[PDB]
Design a protein around this ligand. Structure first.
Ligand code: NA
Ligand code: NA
Length: 129
C-alpha cells in the first residue's frame, strides 16, 4: 500500500508515534517519505547482504528475520515480511524499539540526512489529526 501523507500521519498518530521519545509526528512522516516514499512494500538490499523492509526500511541485520541474513539478530521478534503489510502496526512497534536504542532517530540515515534540523512540521500541515 502507498500511503497518502495525511493518511499516514493519522495512522502513525493512532499508533502512539506522535512525540514518542520526544520525536514529533512530522519527524516520522518525513522519515517514511524519504525511506520508502510511503510504500509499505519497499525493500532495498544493502552491501553487507542485509535487507531493509517496509515503510520505515527496518534492517534485517538487527531487527527482523528474513532467513537470509547470516548471524543476524531478530530484536523485534518478527519475520521481515510482516513489515511489508498494509497494516503498519508491526513496523511501528518495531520502530519504537529502534528509536529507544540510544541513538534516537539517527538510526535512520534518511532522517538524519534529510529531515533532522528541517521544518518537519510541514509534513503534517493541512492534515486533520
Ligand atoms: Na535478522
Ligand atoms: Na533522542
Amino acid at each position: 500500500k502507498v500511503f497518502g501523507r495525511c493518511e499516514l500521519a493519522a495512522a502513525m498518530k493512532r499508533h502512539g508515534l506522535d512525540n514518542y521519545r520526544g520525536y514529533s509526528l512530522g519527524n516520522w512522516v518525513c522519515a517514511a517519505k524519504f525511506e520508502s516514499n510511503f510504500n509499505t512494500q519497499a525493500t532495498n538490499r544493502n552491501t553487507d547482504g542485509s535487507t531493509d523492509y517496509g515503510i520505515l526500511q527496518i534492517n534485517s541485520r538487527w531487527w527482523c528475520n528474513d532467513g537470509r541474513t547470516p548471524g543476524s539478530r531478530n530484536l523485534c521478534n518478527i519475520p521481515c515480511s510482516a513489515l511489508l503489510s498494509s497494516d503498519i502496526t508491526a513496523s511501528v512497534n518495531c520502530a519504537k524499539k529502534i528509536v529507544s536504542d540510544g541513538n534516537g532517530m539517527n538510526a535512520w540515515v534518511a532522517w538524519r540526512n534529510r529531515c533532522k534540523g528541517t521544518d518537519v512540521q510541514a509534513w503534517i500541515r493541512g492534515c486533520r489529526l
